[PDB]
Amino acid sequence: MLTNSEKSRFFLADLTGEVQSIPNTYGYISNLGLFRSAPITQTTFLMDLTDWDVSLLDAVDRDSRKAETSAPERVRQISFPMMYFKEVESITPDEIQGVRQPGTANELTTEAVVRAKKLMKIRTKFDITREFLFMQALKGKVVDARGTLYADLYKQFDVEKKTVYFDLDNPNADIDASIEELRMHMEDEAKTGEIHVVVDRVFFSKLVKHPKIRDAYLAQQTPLAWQQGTDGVQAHMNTFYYGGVKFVQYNGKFKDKRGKVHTLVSIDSVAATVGVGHAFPNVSMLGEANNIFEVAYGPCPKMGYANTLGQELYVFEYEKDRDEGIDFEAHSYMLPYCTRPQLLVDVRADAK
Amino acid sequence: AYQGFTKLGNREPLNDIILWEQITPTGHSRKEYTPQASTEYRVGEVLKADGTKVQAGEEAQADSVCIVNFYADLQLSYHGQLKVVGIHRDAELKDLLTLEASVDAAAVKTALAAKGIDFVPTGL
Amino acid sequence: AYQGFTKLGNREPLNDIILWEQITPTGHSRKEYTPQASTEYRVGEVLKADGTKVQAGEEAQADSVCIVNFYADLQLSYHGQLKVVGIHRDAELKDLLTLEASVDAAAVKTALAAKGIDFVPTGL
């Protein structure tokens, strides 16, 4: 579309669309869809814990008519708090009066375009927060981005955490033993009638450098074999399969309002130079029967929403009186958690 | 029951003190305090600038009026939140303050009036 | 062009800082200044009571936050008006202040906060 030249008011030039630039938005965990939404009607929710045990029978003779019995059941209860997020925005005529929109030579900006832009930005922010909170929940501790602690599943369910150490730096180290230990722990402690481990760059490099694994790794480099996932930023992420356990490299990271960088895959009080990873089972395909990962949602303090079902994200609009502008608001009341914390295992690439 | 009578307790006071406040996107009129250890908060209490309750001899240091009910053992408010909240400016409140022993109510009211807090007379 | 690169300029900041201001028939929260000679004005700058931009050691004298872009050579603002407008009191603004070299931000914020100006936390 024609526009004034760069150095003459009387000569025209041809303009072209805008070149957008958007920050990276990692969504690997959210993309899997293994977290099941569970809206709540109030500010607190409870749950019941149940379990029973069985033992082998003994062969009794037919005529004695002696029999056996079984022990009874036991029950317990738990409680959970929730976290609140909120941010505000505003739009006024001063942002619309005589402002050319970037993509056009003459077309003027309008209220709808600005509204859409701001809503998209807000949704992106909330999605990034969702991903961060999901990663924190998978770590086993729901810690707010500013450090506040809201839930400790290990203490809540009365179970400790296991860590598996890989001596990758030792050429004589054993990897099959560690993998089998992880698998057997996961199988034994599942307590119910496909294992993924999210791995760091350094850990992945150390693992694939090992002499005892190059033979298996180099055989999988054929593209036909790889196709047998995306984080939203990279369309082809490194993957390594061995011993029935799939290793995935995840490089997501986000920045806080203070500029502090938070790496999604990390263990508290551990040097970044040391390889680190987290292991969990894949449950997404269970769908409606997925009782292991859930997210709760609650109502907002607004008058018309006191006792209604929760929502993913509330949006409200208000005038500023005397038609001087418009205001926006965003609300969310969410808490992710895992009902089988014993299945979450840390993985390290350093000796004991 | 053995000896007949049984009692299950009374209802805690609700948050209805506020009659008018300066509504703003950022909650202009409200401030949040970190709860002190081994202390229980209820609606209508006066808090110092450090979150501790005002006692006799320092009415001039009154800072805000409590707005939530907080449980010491749970370390959690009745709405499932981790922090206490108090109004410290630009509000009109029902005259239902709760004060510690020997605290001068008039002195506290005068101290809070400087920050723009007014009290409306309440009926019996 | 010769040497390849060609740059045409940059957007001046837009007037979207205000999040809440006390709307009144005569602009209770705004003031107008007579711009000084040959000084550029951009949104976010801090102005003294005389319309001159704040400098080192003048934090206590901070008066208002500029809101209109003024072109020195053109002698009029980007909206074709002959005065500079700065927010004076009773408003909430984004944390996007522009400060001259070596000017402390905490002192300026404390000085402005006394007049009834609050900054909603913001970040990227």
How many CB pairs below 8 Å do chains A and B form together? 16
- Report the distance separating Cα A30 and Cα A128, nearest Å: 10
How far apart are the CA of B28 and the nearest CA of chain C, in angstroms?
9
Adjacent-strand bridge partners of A46: A79
Sheet order of strands, B18-21 included: B18-21, B91-94, B117-120
C-alpha distances in Å from residue B84, one per residue of A89, B95, B117, C112: 26, 21, 19, 28
Q: Which residues of A touch B79 (CB under 8 A)?
A: 43
Do B46 and B108 form a contact (C-beta atoms < 8 A)?
yes
HSE-up (13 A, CA, CB side) for residue B44: 14
Buried b (16+ CB within 10 A) or exposed e, A137-161: bbbbbbbeeeeeebbebeebeeeee
Do A78 and A47 form a contact (C-beta atoms < 8 A)?
yes
What count of residues does chain A have? 352
CA angle centred on C18, ends C12 and C22, rounded to 5° = 145
3-state secondary structure A290-344: CCCEEEEECCCCCHHHCCCCCCCCEEEEEECCCCCCEEEEEEEEEEEEECCHHHC
Cβ-defined contact of C6 to A90 (cutoff 8 Å): no
Q: Which two three-digit tokens encode residue A148?
A: 């506040």
Buried b (16+ CB within 10 A) or exposed e, A192-223: eeebbbbbbeebbebbbebeebeeeeeeeeee
* Residue B104 neighbours by CB under 8 Å, 6+ apart: B56, B59
Do A141 and A157 form a contact (C-beta atoms < 8 A)?
no
In C, minimum Cα distance to B28 occurs at: C118
CA B30 to chain CA centroid, nearest Å: 12
DSSP labels for B58-122? -GGGEEEEE-S-EETTTTEETTS-SSEEEE-SSEEEES--B--TT--HHHHHHHHHTTTEEEE--
Do C29 and A324 form a contact (C-beta atoms < 8 A)?
no
DSSP labels for A77-125? EEEE--EEEEEEEEE-GGGTTT-B-TT-SSPBP-HHHHHHHHHHHHHHH
- Report the distance separating Cα C98 and Cα A29, nearest Å: 40
- The amino acid occupying position C115 is K
Give the residue from C16, C66, C79, C119 with the most A CB atoms within 10 Å of its CB, the best one to mutate: C16
Nearest C-alpha neighbor of A6 from the set B75, C74, C5: C5
Do C78 and C12 form a contact (C-beta atoms < 8 A)?
yes
Cβ-defined contact of A94 to C121 (cutoff 8 Å): no
Q: Which residues of B touch A81 (CB under 8 A)?
A: 76, 80-82
Do A104 and A1 form a contact (C-beta atoms < 8 A)?
yes
Give the residue from B23, B77, B81, B83 with the most A CB atoms within 10 Å of its CB, the best one to mutate: B81
Residues of A with CB under 8 A from a CB of C: 6, 88-92, 94-95, 97-99, 255-259, 320-322, 324, 327
Chains near A (3 or more Cβ pairs under 8 Å): B, C
Cβ-defined contact of B76 to A329 (cutoff 8 Å): no
Nearest C-alpha neighbor of C46 from the set C34, C29, C21, C64: C64
CA angle centred on A130, ends A124 and A135, rounded to 5° = 130
- Report the distance separating Cα A254 and Cα A128, nearest Å: 8
- Report the distance separating Cα B31 and Cα B67, nearest Å: 10
Give the residue from A16, A86, A90, A125 with the most C CB atoms within 10 Å of its CB, the best one to mutate: A90
Neighbouring C-beta atoms of residue A224, cutoff 10 Å: 6
CA pseudo-torsion sign B66, B72, B75, B80: negative
Q: Which two three-digit tokens encode residue C68?
A: 């209109």
How many CB pairs below 8 Å do chains A and C form together? 35
Phi/psi of residue C44, each to 5°? 105, -15
Chains near C (3 or more Cβ pairs under 8 Å): A, B
Cβ-defined contact of C18 to A321 (cutoff 8 Å): no
The alpha carbon torsion through A55, A59, A64, A67 (nearest 10 deg) reads 20
A135 three-state secondary structure? helix
Cβ-defined contact of B80 to A43 (cutoff 8 Å): yes
Nearest C-alpha neighbor of A348 from the set A171, A182, A112: A182
C74 three-state secondary structure? coil
- Strand runs (DSSP E) across chain A, as ranges? 2-4, 12-14, 36-39, 45-51, 74-80, 83-91, 141-143, 149-152, 163-165, 195-199, 239-242, 245-249, 253-255, 261-263, 276-281, 293-297, 314-319, 326-338, 345-348
Do B90 and B116 form a contact (C-beta atoms < 8 A)?
yes
Do B85 and B21 form a contact (C-beta atoms < 8 A)?
no
Expt. technique: cryo-EM
Q: How far apart are the first and last CA of chain C?
A: 35
Neighbouring C-beta atoms of residue C79, cutoff 10 Å: 13
Q: β-strand B91-94 against B117-120: which pairing, if any?
A: parallel
Cβ-defined contact of C123 to A257 (cutoff 8 Å): yes
Helix (H) or strand (E) holding C64: strand C62-66
- Report the distance separating Cα A285 and Cα A9, nearest Å: 63
